[PDB]
From a paper:
Ub is a small protein comprising 76 amino acid residues, which can be enzymatically connected to various proteins, including other Ub molecules, through (iso)peptide linkages, giving rise to biological messages, so-called “Ub codes”, which are read out by specific Ub-interacting proteins. The Lys48-linked Ub chains serve as tags for protein degradation by the 26S proteasome and interact with the proteasomal subunits and other related proteins through the hydrophobic surfaces of each Ub unit. In contrast, our prior NMR studies revealed that, in the major conformational state of Lys48-linked di-Ub (hereafter simply referred to as diUb), the hydrophobic surfaces are exposed to the solvent and open for the interactions with Ub-interacting proteins.
Thus, we evaluated the possible effects of the substitution of Lys48 of the distal Ub unit on the proportions of open and closed states of diUb. We chose cysteine as a replacement for the Lys48 residue following the previous studies. This implies that the positive charge of Lys48 of the distal Ub unit destabilizes the closed conformation. However, serine substitution of this lysine had little impact on the proportions of closed states (75% at 25 °C, pH 7.0), signifying that, besides the elimination of electrostatic repulsion, the thiol group in K48C-diUb is a stabilizing factor for the closed conformation. We identified the crystal structure of K48C-diUb, which closely resembled the previously reported NMR structure of c-diUb. In this crystal structure, the thiol group of Cys48 of the distal Ub unit is in spatial proximity to the residues from the proximal Ub unit, including Leu71, Leu73, and Gly76, implying that atomic contacts of the thiol group with the C-terminal segment of the proximal Ub unit stabilizes the closed conformation.
Residue numbers in the entry:
A (entry chain B), B (entry chain A): 1 to 76
Amino acid sequence: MQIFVKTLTGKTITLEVEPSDTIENVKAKIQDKEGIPPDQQRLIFAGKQLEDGRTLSDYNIQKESTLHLVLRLRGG
Amino acid sequence: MQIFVKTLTGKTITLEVEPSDTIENVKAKIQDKEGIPPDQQRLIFAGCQLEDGRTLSDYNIQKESTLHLVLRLRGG
């Protein structure tokens, strides 16, 4: 299924995901496409930060859902 | 100075802050106004999560800047 991943800075990523994908697996897909290390990524749905070991299914993420991506950078 | 704090769910909070305020002190102001515990709050500027012990000055937060607020909820 297609989901959108949007930064708060004006970039939309489209991903093909499975409902059984963990949030960490989605971060790996974002690294594959955009080169951002999973350790720096924080994914958000419905205003809440998502936990790495839960699945898209666990969070009721449906086709065409939008996740937001923000970074946790150690340097800044 | 005035800043905006916006959720990703359609709520804008206006705060009066000082540039020497820590990010934790801003979370305390959000708790005072909205009743959200600081421990659940994550504040974001320019697509990056902000660190509790740094100041608005440290992050170049200017008058009329917008921070985003997301929650880290242990249960959901």
